[PDB]
């Protein structure tokens, strides 16, 4: 039983019924956690950890803004929905989870063959840094330039002075 399917089923239910802004900042965290875990267990543990290191800091800053802008509006308001229309919507959605229509690509299993030629064996992050700091160093230096612009941009927007 792939229990990640159940997790996304609950998350989709709570995204349809979410009312206030605090629930939305919880839908975000309830989305990154399935992403981080599935990356950890299937494809990339490096990027599972990079997601946690960067998105959490963004989440708390996002949460602190909710405190300064919460404006009483959706606590006392009413929503109608209907339990039957919610579950029927989620049932129809769950029916079609085939993002791709290449049946052979989705059904036939493949393998790779290992070789011993790579005797200098290092992590993916060392190769990523090796290329990023040598061949795509321009991409890194532009990213540094964009980060500098954000620093100036945030000040010229928020600072009253």
């Amino acid at each position: 039983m792939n229990l990640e399917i159940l997790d996304l089923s609950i998350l989709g239910f709570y995204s349809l019924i979410s009312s206030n802004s605090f629930e939305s900042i919880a839908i975000l965290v309830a989305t990154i956690m399935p992403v981080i875990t599935e990356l950890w267990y299937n494809y990339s543990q490096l990027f599972a950890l990079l997601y946690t290191l960067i998105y959490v800091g963004a989440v708390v800053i996002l949460f602190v803004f909710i405190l300064s802008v919460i404006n009483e509006k959706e606590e006392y308001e009413y929503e109608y929905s209907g339990l039957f229309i919610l579950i029927l919507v989620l049932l129809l959605d769950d029916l079609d989870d085939n993002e791709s229509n290449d049946n052979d690509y989705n059904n036939v299993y493949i393998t790779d063959y290992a070789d011993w030629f790579n005797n200098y064996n290092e992590s993916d992050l060392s190769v990523i840094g090796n290329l990023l700091f040598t061949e795509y160093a321009l991409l890194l230096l532009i990213i540094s330039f964009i980060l500098l612009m954000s620093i100036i941009g945030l000040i010229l927007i928020v600072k009253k002075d």
């Binding site: 030629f117 790579n118 200098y120 190769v127 090796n130 290329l131």
Partner: protein, 60 residues
Amino acid sequence: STADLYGLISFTPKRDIHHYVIRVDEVPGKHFPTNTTGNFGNTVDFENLEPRRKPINPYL
């Protein structure tokens, strides 16, 4: 002459999947940061590389 000159300049030769301009001057993979000799699947010989397709400069 003016009519003839415009006919030459404004003619657009046909492009298809068999003839078009690709701006790549050399074959990649002569050097890698590490482990340049991998599975020995790199069958391109850089010692005896055939001449590449040099781009045409119409003003030369």
